Write a protein that binds this ligand. Sequence first.
Ligand SMILES: Nc1nc2c(ncn2[C@@H]2O[C@H](COP(=O)(O)OP(=O)(O)NP(=O)(O)O)[C@@H](O)[C@H]2O)c(=O)[nH]1
Ligand SMILES: */C(=C\C(=O)N1CC(F)(F)C1)n1cnc(-c2cc(C(F)(F)F)cc(C(F)(F)F)c2)n1
Ligand SMILES: [Cl-]
Ligand SMILES: [Cl-]
Ligand SMILES: [Cl-]
Ligand SMILES: [Mg+2]
Lengths: 209, 130, 1017
Amino acid sequence: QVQFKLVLVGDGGTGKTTFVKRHLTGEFEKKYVATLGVEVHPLVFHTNRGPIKFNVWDTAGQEKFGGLRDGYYIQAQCAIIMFDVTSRVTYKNVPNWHRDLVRVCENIPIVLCGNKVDIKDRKVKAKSIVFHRKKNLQYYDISAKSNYNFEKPFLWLARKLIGDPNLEFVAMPALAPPEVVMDPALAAQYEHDLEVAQTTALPDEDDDL
Amino acid sequence: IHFEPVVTMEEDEEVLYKVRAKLFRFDADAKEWKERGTGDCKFLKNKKTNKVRILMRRDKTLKICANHIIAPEYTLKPNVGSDRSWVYACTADIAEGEAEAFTFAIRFGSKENADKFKEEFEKAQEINKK
Amino acid sequence: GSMEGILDFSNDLDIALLDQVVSTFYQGSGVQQKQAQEILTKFQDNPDAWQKADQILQFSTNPQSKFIALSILDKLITRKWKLLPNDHRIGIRNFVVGMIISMCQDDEVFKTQKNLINKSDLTLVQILKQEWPQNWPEFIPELIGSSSSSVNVCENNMIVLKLLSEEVFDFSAEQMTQAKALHLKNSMSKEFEQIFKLCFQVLEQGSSSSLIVATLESLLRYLHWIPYRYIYETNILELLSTKFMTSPDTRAITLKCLTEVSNLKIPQDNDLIKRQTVLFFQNTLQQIATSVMPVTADLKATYANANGNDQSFLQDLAMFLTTYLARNRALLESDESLRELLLNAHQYLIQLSKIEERELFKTTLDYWHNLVADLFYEPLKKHIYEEICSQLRLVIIENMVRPEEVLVVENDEGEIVREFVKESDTIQLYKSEREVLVYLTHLNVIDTEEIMISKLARQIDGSEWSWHNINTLSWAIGSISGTMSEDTEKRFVVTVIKDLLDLCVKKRGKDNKAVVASDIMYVVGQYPRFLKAHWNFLRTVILKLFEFMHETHEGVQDMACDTFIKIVQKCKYHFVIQQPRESEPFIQTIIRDIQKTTADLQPQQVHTFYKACGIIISEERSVAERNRLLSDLMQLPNMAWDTIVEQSTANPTLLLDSETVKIIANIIKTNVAVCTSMGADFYPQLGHIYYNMLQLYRAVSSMISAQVAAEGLIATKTPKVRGLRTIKKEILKLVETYISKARNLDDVVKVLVEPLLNAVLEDYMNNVPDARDAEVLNCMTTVVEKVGHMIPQGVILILQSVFECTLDMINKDFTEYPEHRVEFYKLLKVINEKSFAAFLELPPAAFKLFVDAICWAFKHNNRDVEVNGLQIALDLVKNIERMGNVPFANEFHKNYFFIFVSETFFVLTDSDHKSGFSKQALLLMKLISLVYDNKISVPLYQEAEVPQGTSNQVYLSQYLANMLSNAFPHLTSEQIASFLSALTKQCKDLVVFKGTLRDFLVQIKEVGGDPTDYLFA
Ligand SMILES: Nc1nc2c(ncn2[C@@H]2O[C@H](COP(=O)(O)OP(=O)(O)NP(=O)(O)O)[C@@H](O)[C@H]2O)c(=O)[nH]1
Ligand SMILES: */C(=C\C(=O)N1CC(F)(F)C1)n1cnc(-c2cc(C(F)(F)F)cc(C(F)(F)F)c2)n1
Ligand SMILES: [Cl-]
Ligand SMILES: [Cl-]
Ligand SMILES: [Cl-]
Ligand SMILES: [Mg+2]
């Protein structure tokens, strides 16, 4: 319906895919599996102006896996440029990504995101991050891991795309859930599945939650 | 003299219990727990039908990460790595859309909260029995 | 599947099928889209795909297909252009040029296919980078000529020239050799006179066109590099600052141009040029006021409305005004006829500073910093800006962000709660706001005080009362501590506190009480100078903080603990002495009631409380009295410890109690906290627990091992085993903390070290990988750092116990055991620095693993590991060189010199370790310089491999040429020879040497790089 093409660009390892997955499923993927060319995922937010759908084109940051490269940007309606605040080279490359992006997409809203602020030893100092000012990009410190500011890039983009500065995310309707009884035939398989689940430790047991 | 003036679906429900929590779902294909959401987990009693459900929404996005009846058949079990979590099988959760079975784990800020959840969970089960 | 047909090059390309695959990818979804993407990538990557590009461009009806065709060509041009036969180069040039001409001459195509034409233009510019001007001398003249034939061609030519300027001046540093960049820059410079003529003519003879906008977009790029005379000796500034400010379509780009004009390199002592710089600013501001908005306009409201391009325009205006004024405001400050202009420009900035947009606020705040720092120093200037500064005081005071210290916040339901997490992204913002407000206070302390005191009065009487208003004001008041004289500050603080206490009595319910309590804590903690002068008040404050330590509001309770230690860090001397009219130093009072004071605190908060007490105790420099205070402070944890030591020594079983495990961990944590603040002074307490603590470490180690044996590796995840390991980790932390601060190193060596090693090393070595604590490695690093020079045999023991077993944990991939990885290399680094002899004693097989371990570290992308690996390598080379001409050094070079050279080259050139370039270059330069300086005393080659007299210099070059020939077979022999000649000649000049490496990294990405590039100087 109301859907917008969003392209996500930035150096390999900056957290693009992890960030999208967090938003898609709620999970935090610890492993680094490099994106091959691009992965497309629809992502819906519920707002006080109705649902907004982003078709997220999560592009490869590794040169060797770049695929169609700027070919992915064609007809994008918005974008996120990612870097990693623990890696100065990734900030240094931001102008390169931005160059390639705006050559294809001349007038779109773009958010610049400095990811991994959860890591204690920050290398790209806050005071250093100024590239967005002359390019009219929005900027946020974010962490896919802690969820710090994780909703901000999508909220800002939605506001710009719908053209409503007072747009807010709203609680989606919660339909009454059904009453189901376990299949007696599957009860023995239930026992096994639960045993494996019980004996697989939960991750990050030192976290606040 | 008259001067003309200038021109969620949780409404029918009582909140029995609310607690801050992190919810996980077990991926059997992989062999790992995956986070589904962090936020307020509510036990909601429908004022018309008297049925009690778990409804949990993610902070900030407010997206539903749990929505299911607290079935009398369910049983909260400990996880090997935690003294502040419960694991249980759910046959019919609709947070993502069509009803689907999951093995859930829910973790709390402390053991005391976890033990309170279980007591409230079991109370809610008795309500759903009536 | 049928879409795969386009990958079969043995058949003719089905263009219709290609258009379907492309459409499926861009317009489709799900599985079909995913399959099409894979097919297209494979198509694109086919090294013969470029040969299909002409056919696609001719017969395709899908613009995305043609874009992809151009991407294929771009890859060919940028990487393999000189591999092509000359006829293919001409052909490609011709069909690219022809396509551009054809798309510009059809109006409907020129209107509707902007993406494809821009891509075509960039593709042309890639050809220019290869061919121009040496093999295309007439390009510029013909482009200039063609511009007159057609408005579409002229506009497009502006796009081509913009892209060319970007590729040559803005983006060449990483992408071209130093020599090629110079060549292209010089070439553009030599013809710019004629380019500018075209640009200026177009700008003269048009108004609001897409042609005008394109021309201005090209000008923006030129301004990065062109001589200022083009701007100042023509009428162009008048056009930019008047005509092009009037139409909104040109206004946006013109403003950006004027911002870059403001950055031109311009003579300093020319009155005429100063006048021109004033004039364009005057013109621009006049246009803003008459065509856009008056100085009085509510820009906060306009920005918030977000119509059209208003947010971008206001951002760009802020950038223009701040850029210009930071450089040129002095031009406006002396002449009375320019005062209104100066102040009006600053009034726009005041209005812009009221906008709700954090990133824009940082930009204007940066400017205000620049201004107020200048006014602080420059004679006779502050009075000019007194009204601006007064308004700015209000803006800043009203937009103070929450300090890191203030731990309460309002949630979505209107409740004042403890924050879930730190607001990490406002740390810098707070510091910046404080900096400006401090300067503003100094500039007029009377105005600042009057504003704050009258605002506070309006909170009290209720007229302006709100949480937002009392908060921002309180934060502002706290933030200016130090600006007033002690005497002035005294009166100010007294008035503020009197008023804050009035509010706290009147504003009720847990939410209000929490807000006001947080604000008083913040203010009071910010004025230690005052507290030190007013003991009765300080004592009262501390007692009140103790009351808050029993608050049911967890935010207030936590903030009281932080505020207590914050005050103690600054005022501790006043707690250790006996104050007039007191019967005892207050530290005695605190210690005596510590159980009651801390009863409702969480353990970590109790530890903070103890740490603060340690700060105070360390003020007592009489040793007997200090040790007595320490003993008194540690009474409760020592009494709990003593009862546990008695029980555990009777029964290892009683330690199987999770309650007991928690108690022990908290005892050790309390010791850690006190040791952190007392440092060297902590020793007597360490001595009280040391031997029993190490026995406890051993007992807990046995329980962990027993549990893993009985339950499997999964036991390490259980609360019980995690709790046991916490005891081990905290013990290690305690010892590390003490040793890192120890002043008596003899005691460390004679008393602490042997039992520590005895307790920890064999236990680490002999546990399974998943039960090994990385904290052992961290503890040993500090031991070696501080006393390694005194314990050579101890260092050897450390290596024996941890080296091979830890290496085996981390040498299968780059990700498992991340903490062990990081601590392992920190340990090796300090051993190599402080006790190199330890490595000399290794058997040859183990020394080989050490070299392997260093090179393995190089290959990490993890910065912590990579950096240490490169440093160890450099330190190792230095260690070897220091030995001189001895057998161990000779054998080291014979065995490992070329391994280090080749491994360093590998990470330099694989494009996957760019973060380490500087240190890789340093290491390579050291290695090469060793041979260049004849510092290696034996032949690096085995005999009969090369003539007997052969110098290591000659052999190094031969080795490297062969290595590079085989690793980079697309390079010519002369490219390799020239690179190596330059590199070796430059091995005493790091900056030049690095340039040569960067040039090599460019050349390896293409074919036919010019070997003379390495002569650049
Ligand atoms: N500490 C921390 N790690 C993160 C964060 N976000 C992502 N990561 C980690 O960074 C690694 C790379 O993440 P990934 O999302 O694959 O990066 P990417 O930008 O998509 N890489 P590519 O361009 O190659 O597809 C993963 O190990 C992931 O767990 C974060 O916010 N904090
Ligand atoms: C207000 C106290 C309150 O609720 N009262 C007084 C009553 F009338 F009895 C009811 N309130 C909040 N915070 C303070 C306060 C804080 C601090 C500290 F610095 F510790 F934060 C110090 C004091 C002091 F007593 F020293 F003034 C007061 N009072
Ligand atoms: Cl296109
Ligand atoms: Cl002091
Ligand atoms: Cl050659
Ligand atoms: Mg990815």
